[PDB]
Every structure is written in structure tokens, then in C-alpha cells.
Amino acid sequence: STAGKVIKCKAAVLWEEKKPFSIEEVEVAPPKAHEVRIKMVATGICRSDDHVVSGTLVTPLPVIAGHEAAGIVESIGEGVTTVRPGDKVIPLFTPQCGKCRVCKHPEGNFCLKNDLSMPRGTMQDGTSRFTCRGKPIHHFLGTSTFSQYTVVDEISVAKIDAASPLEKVCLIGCGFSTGYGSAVKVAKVTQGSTCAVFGLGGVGLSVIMGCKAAGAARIIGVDINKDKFAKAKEVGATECVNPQDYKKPIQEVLTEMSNGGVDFSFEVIGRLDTMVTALSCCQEAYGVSVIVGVPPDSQNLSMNPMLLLSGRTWKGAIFGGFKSKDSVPKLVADFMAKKFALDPLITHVLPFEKINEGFDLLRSGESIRTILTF
Amino acid sequence: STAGKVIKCKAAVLWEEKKPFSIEEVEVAPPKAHEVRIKMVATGICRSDDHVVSGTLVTPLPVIAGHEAAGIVESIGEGVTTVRPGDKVIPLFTPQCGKCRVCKHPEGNFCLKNDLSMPRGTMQDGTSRFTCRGKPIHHFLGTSTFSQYTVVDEISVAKIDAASPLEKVCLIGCGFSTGYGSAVKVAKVTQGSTCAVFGLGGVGLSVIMGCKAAGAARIIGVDINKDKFAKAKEVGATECVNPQDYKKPIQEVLTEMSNGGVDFSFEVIGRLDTMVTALSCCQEAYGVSVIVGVPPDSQNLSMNPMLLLSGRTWKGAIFGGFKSKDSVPKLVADFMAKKFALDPLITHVLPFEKINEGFDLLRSGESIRTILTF
Numbered sequence A, B: 001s002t003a004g005k006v007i008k009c010k011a012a013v014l015w016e017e018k019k020p021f022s023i024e025e026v027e028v029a030p031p032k033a034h035e036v037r038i039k040m041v042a043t044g045i046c047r048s049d050d051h052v053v054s055g056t057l058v059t060p061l062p063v064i065a066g067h068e069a070a071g072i073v074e075s076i077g078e079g080v081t082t083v084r085p086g087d088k089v090i091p092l093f094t095p096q097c098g099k100c101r102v103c104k105h106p107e108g109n110f111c112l113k114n115d116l117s118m119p120r121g122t123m124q125d126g127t128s129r130f131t132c133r134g135k136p137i138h139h140f141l142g143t144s145t146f147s148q149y150t151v152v153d154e155i156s157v158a159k160i161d162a163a164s165p166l167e168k169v170c171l172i173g174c175g176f177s178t179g180y181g182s183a184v185k186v187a188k189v190t191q192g193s194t195c196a197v198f199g200l201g202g203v204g205l206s207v208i209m210g211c212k213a214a215g216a217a218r219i220i221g222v223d224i225n226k227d228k229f230a231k232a233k234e235v236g237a238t239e240c241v242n243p244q245d246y247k248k249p250i251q252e253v254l255t256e257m258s259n260g261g262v263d264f265s266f267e268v269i270g271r272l273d274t275m276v277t278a279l280s281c282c283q284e285a286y287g288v289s290v291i292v293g294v295p296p297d298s299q300n301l302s303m304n305p306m307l308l309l310s311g312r313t314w315k316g317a318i319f320g321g322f323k324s325k326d327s328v329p330k331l332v333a334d335f336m337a338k339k340f341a342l343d344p345l346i347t348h349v350l351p352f353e354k355i356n357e358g359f360d361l362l363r364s365g366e367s368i369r370t371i372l373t374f
Ligand SMILES: NC(=O)c1ccc[n+]([C@@H]2O[C@H](COP(=O)([O-])OP(=O)([O-])OC[C@H]3O[C@@H](n4cnc5c(N)[nH+]cnc54)[C@H](O)[C@@H]3O)[C@@H](O)[C@H]2O)c1
Pocket: A045, A046, A047, A048, A051, A174, A175, A178, A198, A199, A200, A201, A202, A203, A204, A222, A223, A224, A225, A228, A243, A268, A269, A270, A271, A274, A291, A292, A293, A294, A295, A317, A318, A319, A320, A365, A368, B309
């Protein structure tokens, strides 16, 4: 029995940038008031986790990363009402406090309680539940899913279907929901439209899924890795283009292909140059471009505002625009009801102990999502 | 008495940047097929006309500028169906061909026949109707309203109510419609919202009018010229701020005043720095910023795309997003029915012959709109 006790378990600790994860014993404190301690079942490897390793994302180190996951509630702190021990849950890397001006807004999802903008690497109360070799270890996005056990604030966890296959639905914790929502909710892709999707990883494939669900007539995948094209076509891409095959800039190619610009474009990579290319390739009077990717910390892009003055719309979003705690249980119900597929995103299933091998698969271009199983 | 004949008349010719207009005789050719020759009655001085003088806006010189105007059809070319001699008309600096992909789109207005993106300074057929001193003179935006007579393509003119007061409704040809539409159509300002309007000239006052018509609860005017504040409050601003009065950047001031960012912001000046400031000051998760001001030619802004990733929407528009030929007659009808006021924008009236004094008034900061009468 572990309730009320410190748990000693295995986790993947990141001690410094640009080094492998260290798989070793940590101590996980019991949950305080309004906190939930979760036994992890499965976690995906998202490129955003790799950004912490590479220094593309700055967050306090040392850290337990991981934000795309599913598990089972081990215990609850005083005052928790939304989950109980034994419940299947998905941690929410974007919280939903329900009380802030964003949570109360019909179209906001970036709750002011988030730990993304100005990361502290703590629980809501400004403390950590993790130690390792006698040192405090930071949280990541209020989730820290690269551990056999984590502790999250109640506002950062959603209860899901007890019959959920956790090794699949962990993807609703980040990559699927982000891409799918970016298309259906943030862009609001229209029936018969032409879309361009820059980046054909797990998130870009989920954007394709959403564009197809929304009835797009044409979905042009763009990637410099042609090995990504076959799966992009399987989930709905009608064409794929590799910028490296062209003498012209790809914005010009895509404008020509779409007879004057696309209806909707998506940046799903994380590069400043592809953000401006994606904006430019949408039709100048009525096009919409959505930034999904995460670029290198503190770097500015350069652009000509005439791109906007003609009528383009440029937007971005976290987690597909979904209000996280309302949406995650509905997405899992929709998955259970066969409304979308997750298997096309899963290329590799490894034990948690092989986390580093999973990151190497992502970095080499081989994988879409590796699911780590605890 | 002049149908089919060259007309000699006075126009304001701009031979050189950064010089006064030359009021002198020009020859105005009769209209060719699908062209309309207009006797001008009134034209406003818009800051975009001054941009041609200053080189902020690059268009071929020498030129007859002017784009905000109203007049009476003198004659029609072969095949014209939409106006007749003696009709009151407003030239449309954004055409509406009705046939291109943008004209057919429900939300597009930047018709592909425009002469704004890559100005040629001609009629649609690539030629000029103007001669001065025996030399061909460029058109401007297909309108060239700083002339006693102009010739426009049929897709660049709208018939308006025969009882229209042309000395007022000329403002529907640019500044009013632009500002009002930027609020009501492009931003879609909501009831009870907080708006920030950067620049309190004729266009920014028109934005305020639209924000107030849309039911905004707070409308914060921003200008470095505090002489602009009284009129801004008369048309609906709830409070005005001068960035020069503050130690901190105004985006910080406006974020504080709005308890975390505004719902809608508008750049109505034409500076790269205020475009980024205006984006920054809208709430990071659900705010909308609209670029209205014309940026200096060929210059790029620098910005951090994290401003968009959190959820902001950034857009721009020409002519308030209005499909020009459909909308201008409706706007005139609404003015006739007192659905909005134009007099607050008109600070000065001058004869056409005093055009240069009119530009001096704008450059000094004294005027909002000067209306020139032919
Ligand atoms: N906004 C959000 O909430 C959110 C959520 C999840 C992921 N992300 C970010 O989204 C991005 C994609 O994540 P992912 O799908 O896991 O990554 P991924 O699996 O590494 O996919 C990126 C894809 O981009 C391709 N690519 C790289 N450079 C280029 C280029 N120059 N042109 C075209 N294609 C190129 C690359 O080959 C790969 O297939 C990353 O920056 C993530 O950090 C954001």
C-alpha cells in the first residue's frame, strides 16, 4: 500500500541539456491538497520533450520531462473531487482551472495557471514532489510523465473511459489532439478547401487527419524527409512535396499548385523560416495560417506585414485550441466510438527503460510516435 | 457635349516625391470599352495619398493620386452596364471584378485586379488616360481622384444614391469604410469587449465608431498627439493614452489597464513597431489584432512567434474587408438613413486648388479629413 507514503520508483531524469536521460530511482512525495498521484501506464515521445534536451525549449533543470501520457490514479489529496483511486487519467500539460479569464472565454484554452510561458518547473504551490540522490527535481508542464509515478494538480488531470487502451489514448495528451484541433478548431478547415501541412511527424499527421475529417479536397504534405510521405498519404494527404526537390522557394511552388494560394496552411515543425513560408503560401486575401511548431527560444522571425494587410490571418495555438479538461474525456470517448484512429501515429512500442533509444528513433527520422510502456 | 472627346481640365500632378502637387492642365482621354469618365465633385485627403508623396508607398511617378472621392458620371465607354451619365458614383480603389477567386469567396475583398500589390499606375489595359505637358501621367489605384475628371475601369466604380451629399460620402471611398469595417467585419468586435485603437486620425476614428457600434464596453485610443483625444472620446473612446507619458512600453500599460490584455487591437498608423506593440497588447490566448496602417515600402518587422503560439490571431485588411462594389452603395444608403455619422471626421473644407494647404494641415497634425471641392 502506497497511499500517504513516499514512493521510491524509477524515472527518467534529465540532469543537463544535450545528455541522455538517466533512468534511476526517485522519491515521489504523496499528493497534497488538490493533488493527484498517478501510476503511469504509457507515455509518448513528443518532439517538444526533445526540445528540452536540445535547448530549443528552456525549462528549469534538472527535470522529469514527459507530457503525453496516460495512467491510473494511485491516490488523491484532500479536496479532490474529479478523479478517484483506480481511475484512468490523462495528465493535462495545459491546465483548465475553470476560474481564469481564459478558461471562462468561449475560445480560449491557454489557462493562466499554465507552466509554459514562464516555466517554474513546479507544482501550482511552487514546490516539487520529486527528489533524486537527495536533490529536488523540477516538474515539466505540471505533468512529468517520464516516471513510474507522478503528482499533478487536479486542474492538470482528466478522468477518461475506464475501458480506454492507455497505450493508444496517451496520444490524446498531446500530439493527436494538438494536430487534429489545429485543423478542426483553430483553423476551422472548410469542406472542399486546399490545405498545406508543413511537417509530417506525429502532430502534422494529426493535422492531416483533421483536415480530411473537415472535408478538405486537397491536403498537400510538405517535408524534407520523403520517407514521411507514404504515411501522410495513408491518413489523407493528396500530394506530398519535398522543398529540396525544387529550384523555387516552396511558397512559390505551393502558390502555383493551388492556383494562387492555399486556403489553410499549418507550420508543424518549429522553424522561423517555415512559419513565414507557411504564411506566404496561403491565399493573400482570405488564407489562414496556423503556427503549431515550437521554434528555438528567444528568436524573432522577420516578415513583411503586407502579407497580412492584403487579408491573411495568422494564428497559433497550444493543444489544438482545446479546453483541456473538458475536451480530453470527449476525445477518448470519440476514439472508443471509432471517430478517429491513433494506430497510424504509432510506429514503435518500447519499454520505458528504452527511453533513450526512443529519442534516437525520433532524432534519426525513423519514428512518428514511440509509445513507452511502464 | 464632351462624350467621345478629350477633356482638358485641371489636376494635381505629382512629378517628384517630397514636392508639392502641381495644379495644372491635363488631357483626359475618353473612356474605352468598360471604362467610365467621372466629373469629380469632392475628394478627401487620406494619409495613404501622403504616403505617395513621402515615398512610404511606392507607385510609378509622375502620378495623379487621390482615391477617396465622389463624383458624377460624364460618359461611359462601350459595354458599360452598371452606371450611366449623370449617376453619382464613388471610385473603388479596391476593385470588385466579380469573377476572380477572391471576388467569389464569401470573405475575400482584395480582388486580383487591384493595382495595390504591385502597382503599375495604369488602367486595367496597361495604358494611361492622362497626358500633361505632352507626357503620359500614371494613374493611382485605378482611381486618380485628384483631377476635375478621371477615367476608371467599370470594376472600379459604384453607383450610389442620386440624393447623396457627395462632399460627405466621399469618405465612404476610403477612410470611413476602412476603419468601420476593420472593426465590424475584420475583427468582428463583440459586445462588452475591450478594444485598443492605435492612431486617432480619420481611419482610427472610424475604427472607434465601429467598435462602439459593435457594443464594445471599453475603447482605448492610443496616440502620441494628445490633441486627437477630444474627438476620439466624442466618437466613442472611453479613455485615451499617450505612449510618451509612460516610462514602460505601451503594450505593458495596455495589458495592465485591461487586466491581462485587450480583446481587439488595431494598428491604424503605419509603423512596424506599433504593429508588434498592437499584437502584444491583445490577450495572449484569445486576443485579435488587425493591421490597418500602411507599412513603409519593402521593410520587414521582427517579432517573436510565441505571441501567436499562445492563441493570438493577427490579421490585416484593405478597405475594412468590404467587397467594394457590393458594399459602397449600401454604406451610402445607411449613411442616408443616419446609421453612422461622417461629420466628426471632417475638420476642414478647401477648394481643390488649395490641395497643398490640405496636405500641410494633415502633416502638421491639425486635421482629420480635409474635403476638397472641385
Ligand atoms: N502547439 C502545440 O501545442 C504543440 C504540440 C505538440 C507539438 N508541438 C511542436 O510541433 C512540432 C512538431 O512536433 P512532432 O510532430 O512531434 O515532431 P516531429 O515528429 O519531429 O516532426 C517534424 C517533421 O518536420 C520535418 N521537417 C524538419 N525540417 C523541415 C523543413 N525545413 N521543411 C519541412 N519539413 C521539415 C521533419 O522531417 C519531421 O517529419 C514541434 O516543434 C513540437 O515541439 C507543438
